[PDB]
Structure formats: structure tokens, C-alpha cells
Amino acid sequence: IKVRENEPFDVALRRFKRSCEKAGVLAEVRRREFYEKPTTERKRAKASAVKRHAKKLARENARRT
Template structure:
């Protein structure tokens, strides 16, 4: 779980922006969305293969 320390006299909006950036860099939301529903192993392999083809 990413965490940040709010500095003295730091506006709340800036702290939220830093936290959002940290969460995005760690890929936490992407992982949560991927694990939201069960994905069959065959569907997972198919998705990963399609992503590999798309990358090339």
C-alpha cells in the first residue's frame, strides 16, 4: 500500500495529487481491476498472448 507523508503547510490538493501519482506508479489500481472478477486460466493466457502480439 503506497503512503505519503503530508508536509507542514502542504495543501490537501497537492498531497492527494502526490498520492494518486504514487498509486499509479505502483500499478495498484490496474491490479485491483484485474482481480475484481475471476478470470479463467485459459482466458488469462489468451489475454496475455493478445497483449504480447499487440506489443510487437
């Protein structure tokens, strides 16, 4: 966003700050208001997020190896 760091030049320390929220936002304002699909995608997201919570908690029983 704003790096005015000294020493050896290596954006390296720039992509830490910039790839934080500067491309996910511009790719989703890229097209389509949606107006109701955000809802669908949003609600599909957390039904798969608790799919990672309620399975990986139940996956610590055994591993067959």
C-alpha cells in the same frame, strides 16, 4: 501508498504513488479465475506489441506529406 508530506496539502503528490499499481490489480482480482484466458489475452498482447515495433520501424521511410 504512504504520503506524510509537509507544506501545502494537495494529494496531487499522492496520486503519483498510488495510481501506480493500486487499481489495475484490484480490477483484475474483481472477478473470474480465467485459468486460460490470461494466456489468450497475454499472447494477443505481445503479438500486437511487436506489431508496433515492426510497423513503426517500417513507417520511417516516408509520410506522404
